[PDB]
């Protein structure tokens, strides 16, 4: 029939990983050097194009 | 001739240049009448051109293309037992669908294939017709009418080669049965040819167990009886000779457990042979070596059948593997839960050799979790080493929360309601929630109960339970039946075994009362409370703060934590007061849940429930009357109204209640009935022994997507509640209620629907043996 007139109140999402904090690398002294990256954990780190968050592509 | 241009007259699916590439007369190439006819077939070789007429304007080609693509819809009609997507799967098997081209040739072919689908499923007397309904711009609808005459159903097996057993008893030894009478009606009768194969293995097992090792099935031919229903068969077998287990000569990669292996060779030399036990003893090795770490214990029997004495010798070949197969385990379906709470539910540890049942024991904790819908195991032996098995556990979780309600005592005369909700480990976070209460202008009842079962890894089950009832019976004031009752219960859960489990805790309860009814056992309990009340007036006020020790015990060998099928969870509960309490009494209660599978594929399961309960004094001051036993309505018994089972109230001839309305409430007062008034209000008895006879039934009437969750069960209950102190010298005009013979009875059916936030149970029940004074509502909502 009808379900109008503010059917949802404070219902949405966000961009929390962007809102999350970044990280910081870890140190191993001389002689304690073990493998640290085992796959796609190595990524190209990039400021390939910004306009992030809500400024990202919408359509 | 060389083409100047090809005129692409209507494509409707394909591109212009993609049409040009199918043409062998494309722009820039020499064109003759042969390649024009090569263009007819190659544009037909697209599979999407209904008609192609390659012509030319001198040399400038022009192709009158008619086109078959998208079928816009396929309309099914007349199936009524089979899903139309299954018929669309046959249409998928032709590679034709919405979007595809139509082919008038494949109309009868898919009609044949659906009649061949009809042929396969269990019919043949079922015809179809595809109605092409042409739609705009190239499109067509495939309207499909399914003229299903009748199915094929079994009539009679013939078995030839049988020389020890009845064919007809073997029907009774087979799943396929042909017997539903008119005055001895039992079961149903169907056909599918895969069951024929299964009945053959049933027979293959049926001769294996005796020692028939020269037994073989020759063949089996179904009579294509000219009626399109007649399913008679012959079954060609060779009976073979009987053979006897004369010895076992097991060897192989015995891995030093050869004595433990020999424990699985515990046989008698010369008993008549069965291979299922040989199959069974093979599994026990894989349970032996499975708990000994061997994830692939390859075991290969070989029956060295000796026809010379009609016996069998038993070669069994063994490959073990290794122990430390188990590397680690993975978990899937933690998306709304806490992983360690899942990962605490195991007993096979990473960094160990495999325990095969330790998985399953852990999976039993997963099974007796009950916060799941599936718990599944994914035993991936990791490549790189056979000391590497990572067992993923994809589980399907379950719904959480459960609300209960009854709309009553207002909702238009003020803000008044029932309340109550659970959260069921608080979305699996580790914190069991059950809360209820009610806010009315009769009373204000509050309650809290919360349990972390796992404060420590030792199963430290802190259950904290609270309540604050302002139970006043508010009609004008605190004059009718008042108790501000409040207090707590700290309780701990105790592991005693993997199945034995103790409960104990400490309870506080403080109750403050005012101006109570001319109920006389209420006066009698006040008299056993050492108090001497005015029996003819509700003016009597009381404060009591009781102090009790609570205890209990749990068994758990019963299948699921939410949908169990077999076994028992024996649940001792009880309580007793302490020095320092104003009353010295006790209460103990025994309720059970015994599950016996009628069907052991569990289409039918006997469920056994009773409720034993008894509480009385430790000398002098007794157990209070509100701690008696009250039933009816739903509680474990339907047919009645709630708490309408037990001894009933009598009013003392009464004067002044501190509420004398205009004949609204009758309490033997001076507003009428100024005399002894035995009332029908079931005030409960100090002893309860009730039970029900409830049995699992299936439901073949709905989609079994949700029937697996739905419980369908008929129940048959009875009950008797009574107070041991009922001395009918004082109840000389009243029925005695120290009797364990107040035999009520009702029966009915249970209708549980599993809603996505808890179960929705409903019932109808009709009592047909009853000790009167009870209120009855034969329909029940059990939300």
């Amino acid at each position: 029939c009808s379900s109008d007139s503010r059917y949802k109140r404070q219902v949405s999402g966000d961009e929390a990983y962007l809102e999350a904090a970044p990280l910081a690398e870890l140190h191993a002294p001389a002689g304690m050097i073990l493998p640290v990256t085992s796959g796609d954990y190595a990524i190209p780190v990039t400021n390939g194009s910004g306009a992030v968050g809500k400024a990202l592509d919408i359509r | 001739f060389v083409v100047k241009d090809i005129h692409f007259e209507g494509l409707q699916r394909v591109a212009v240049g993609a049409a040009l590439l199918s043409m062998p007369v494309r722009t820039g190439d020499t064109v003759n009448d042969e390649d024009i006819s090569n263009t007819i077939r190659a544009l037909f070789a697209t599979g999407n051109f209904e008609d192609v007429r390659v012509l030319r304007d001198g040399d400038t080609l022009l192709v009158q293309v008619k086109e078959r693509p998208t079928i816009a819809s396929i309309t099914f009609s007349g199936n009524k037992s089979v899903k139309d997507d299954m018929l669309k799967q046959n249409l998928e098997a032709s590679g034709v669908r919405v979007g595809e081209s139509l082919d008038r040739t494949t109309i009868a072919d898919i009609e044949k294939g659906l009649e061949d689908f009809y042929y396969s499923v269990g019919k043949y007397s079922a015809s179809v017709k595809a109605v092409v309904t042409p739609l705009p711009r190239n499109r067509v609808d495939l309207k499909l009418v399914f003229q299903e005459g009748v199915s094929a159903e079994i009539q009679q097996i013939n078995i030839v080669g049988n020389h020890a057993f009845t064919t007809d008893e073997l029907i009774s030894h087979f799943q396929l049965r042909d017997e539903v009478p008119w005055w001895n009606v039992v079961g149903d009768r169907k056909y599918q040819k895969q069951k024929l194969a299964g009945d053959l293995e049933t027979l293959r097992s049926y001769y294996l167990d005796r020692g028939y090792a020269r037994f073989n099935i020759d063949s089996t031919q179904v009579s294509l009886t000219p009626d399109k229903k007649g399913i008679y068969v012959t079954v060609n077998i060779t009976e073979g000779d009987q053979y006897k287990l004369s010895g076992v000569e097991v060897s192989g990669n015995l891995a030093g457990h050869s004595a433990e292996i020999e424990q699985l060779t515990k046989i008698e030399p010369g008993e008549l042979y069965n291979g299922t036990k040989v199959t069974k003893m093979e599994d026990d090795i894989k349970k032996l070596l499975g708990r000994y770490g061997y994830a692939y214990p390859r075991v290969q029997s070989m029956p060295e059948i000796n026809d010379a004495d009609k016996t069998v010798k038993l070669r069994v070949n063994v490959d073990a593997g290794n122990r430390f197969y188990v590397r680690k385990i993975r978990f899937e379906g933690n998306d709304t839960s806490k992983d360690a709470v899942l990962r605490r539910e195991m007993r096979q540890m990473e960094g160990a050799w495999l325990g095969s049942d330790l998985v399953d024991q852990g999976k039993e904790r997963l099974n007796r979790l009950g916060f799941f819908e599936t718990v599944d195991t994914d035993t991936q032996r990791v490549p790189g080493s056979p000391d590497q098995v990572d067992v993923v556990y994809k589980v399907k979780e379950r719904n959480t929360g459960s609300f209960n309600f009854g709309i009553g005592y207002g909702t238009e005369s003020g803000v008044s309601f029932q309340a109550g909700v659970q959260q069921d480990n608080w979305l699996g976070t580790g914190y069991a929630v059950g809360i209820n209460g009610t806010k009315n202008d009769y009373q204000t009842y509050a309650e809290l109960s919360v349990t972390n079962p796992y404060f420590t890894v030792d199963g430290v089950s802190l259950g904290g339970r609270l309540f604050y009832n302002d139970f006043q019976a508010d009609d004008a004031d605190l004059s009718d039946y008042t108790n501000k009752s409040y207090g707590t219960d700290v309780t701990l859960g105790f592991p005693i075994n993997e199945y034995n489990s103790l409960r104990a805790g400490l309870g506080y309860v403080h109750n403050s009362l005012s101006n109570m009814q001319p109920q006389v056992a209420m006066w009698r309990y006040l008299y056993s409370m050492g108090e001497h009340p005015s029996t003819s007036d509700q003016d009597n006020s009381f404060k009591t703060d009781d102090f009790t020790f609570n205890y209990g015990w749990t068994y758990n060998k019963l299948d699921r934590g939410y949908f169990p099928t077999d076994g028992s969870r024996v649940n001792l509960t009880g309580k007793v007061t302490i020095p320092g309490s104003d009353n010295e009494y006790y209460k103990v209660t025994l309720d059970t849940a015994t599950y016996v599978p009628i069907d052991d594929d569990h289409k039918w399961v006997v469920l056994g429930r009773t409720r034993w309960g008894y509480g009385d004094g430790l000398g002098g001051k007794e157990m209070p009357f509100y701690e008696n036993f009250y039933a009816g309505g739903s509680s474990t018994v339907r047919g009645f109204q709630s708490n309408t089972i037990g001894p009933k109230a009598v009013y003392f001839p009464h004067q002044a209640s501190n509420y004398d309305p205009d004949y609204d409430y009758e309490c033997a007062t001076q507003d009428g009935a100024k005399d002894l008034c035995k009332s029908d209000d079931a005030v409960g008895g100090n002893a309860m022994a009730v039970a029900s006879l409830e049995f699992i039934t299936p439901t073949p009437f709905i989609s079994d997507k949700y029937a697996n969750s739905v419980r369908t069960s008929f129940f048959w209950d009875m009950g008797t509640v009574w107070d041991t102190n009922w001395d009918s010298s004082q109840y000389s005009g009243y029925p005695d209620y120290s009797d364990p013979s107040n035999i009520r009875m009702s029966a009915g059916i249970a209708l549980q629907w599993m809603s996505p936030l808890g179960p929705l149970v409903f019932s109808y029940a009709q009592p047909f043996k009853k000790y009167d004074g009870d209120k009855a509502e034969q329909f029940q909502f059990n939300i």
Binding site: - | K80, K112, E115, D116, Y119, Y124, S125, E148, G149, V150, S151, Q155, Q156, N158, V160, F165, T166, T167, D168, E169, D188, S219, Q221, V222, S223, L224, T225, P226, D227, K228, G230, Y232, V233, T234, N236
Partner: protein, 371 residues
């Protein structure tokens, strides 16, 4: 539940019931029971004014064909086992040749019973069932099995002359490819849409021709029940290929004289050059021996469950599994009479022997019908 969700198929009834030669019976005697629902290739036999009648699961009479009075009785409802006086339960039709009663059971036993009392002249268990009544002749119990075995037994004792494996379909595509004898060679058709010729005297395959299509990747008719029993007039064989297809072909070689791969006919008599048929949809037609050329037809009756077409009193006589009996013109399809003689219906075949016409209802069996 199951009574309300019933799915029904619909056939055309029997039209043009006639009585122009108003039918009656000579007697009924019947036997009592028989086929009923339990379909089989059993059918009665008649010779020497002795009705060779019986209950299928039960009694084994001998009825005197003047009144069907019992000459003698035995029963194969005896000889205790798992059933403890195990019932008769016959597969093939009745054969009485010489002083024996040759019959093949659904118990996969075959019998010779002395025709003067029914005393068992000899006994043999047949390996599996038979899709064929044994054509017991030439010292041989000529059998086409359910296993597709040409098991010839010496009809003096049942001594197995040979057992020769035959053409084989997937399942029992029901139809009698009876092993028929013609000019010294065993002539069998085949329920796999195939035909053959075999040496009668040793079971040596003279030739074998696949002809027509059958269920499994080209699924065929189950309202047409193909009489794959071959009838052989001179060495062009005229027989049916399973799915009902008509074929004329050399007996010496199996080479096709002509064939109708359009046939769905049920029961057939090559009546001169007017071959009389029962179609799947039960239109009658008279077809030639040079082709399937309609000399006359009858689509008048349609969609019943018929027996074999017989010629009696000069008229084409057929009964059905409804209980109706029909008297058609031997010429162009005209009802000479019609009789709904019972409702038990007739699965077995009319026996127009001894100058009589012997039929068998499903459980009301024998009505010796005259007009």
């Amino acid at each position: 539940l199951f009574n309300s969700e019933e799915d029904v198929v619909k056939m055309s009834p029997l039209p043009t019931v006639e009585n122009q030669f108003t039918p009656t019976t000579a007697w009924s005697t019947s036997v009592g029971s028989g086929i009923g629902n339990f379909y089989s290739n059993l059918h009665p036999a008649l010779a020497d004014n002795v009705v060779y009648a019986a209950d299928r699961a039960g009694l084994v009479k001998a009825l005197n064909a003047d009144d069907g009075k019992e000459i003698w009785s035995v029963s194969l409802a005896e000889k205790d086992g798992w059933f403890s006086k195990e019932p008769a339960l016959l597969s093939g039709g009745v054969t009485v040749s010489g002083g024996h009663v040759y019959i093949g059971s659904e118990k996969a036993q075959v019998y010779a019973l002395n025709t003067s009392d029914g005393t068992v002249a000899w006994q043999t268990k047949v390996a599996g069932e038979a899709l064929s009544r044994p054509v017991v002749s030439d010292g041989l119990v000529l059998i086409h099995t359910s296993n597709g075995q040409l098991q010839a037994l010496n009809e003096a004792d049942g001594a197995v002359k040979w057992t020769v494996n035959l053409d084989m379909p997937s399942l029992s595509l029901r139809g009698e490819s009876a092993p028929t004898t013609a000019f010294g060679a065993a002539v069998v058709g085949g329920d796999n849409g195939r035909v053959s010729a075999v040496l009668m005297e040793q079971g040596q395959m003279i030739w074998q021709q696949r002809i027509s299509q059958a269920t499994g990747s080209t699924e065929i008719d189950r309202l047409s029940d193909v009489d794959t029993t071959p009838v052989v007039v001179n060495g062009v064989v005229f027989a049916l290929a399973y799915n009902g297809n008509l074929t004329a072909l050399d007996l010496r070689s199996g080479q096709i004289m002509w064939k109708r791969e359009l046939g769905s006919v049920n029961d057939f008599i090559v009546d001169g050059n007017r071959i009389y048929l029962v179609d799947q949809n039960d239109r009658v037609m008279a077809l030639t021996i040079d082709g399937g050329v309609t000399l006359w037809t009858q689509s008048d009756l349609l969609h019943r469950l018929l027996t074999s077409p017989v010629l009696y009193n000069g008229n084409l006589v057929v009964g059905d599994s409804e209980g109706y009996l029909h008297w058609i013109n031997v010429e162009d399809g005209r009802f000479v009479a019609q009789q709904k003689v019972d409702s038990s219906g007739f699965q077995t075949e009319p026996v127009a022997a001894d100058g009589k016409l012997l039929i068998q209802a499903k459980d009301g069996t024998v009505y010796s019908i005259t007009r």
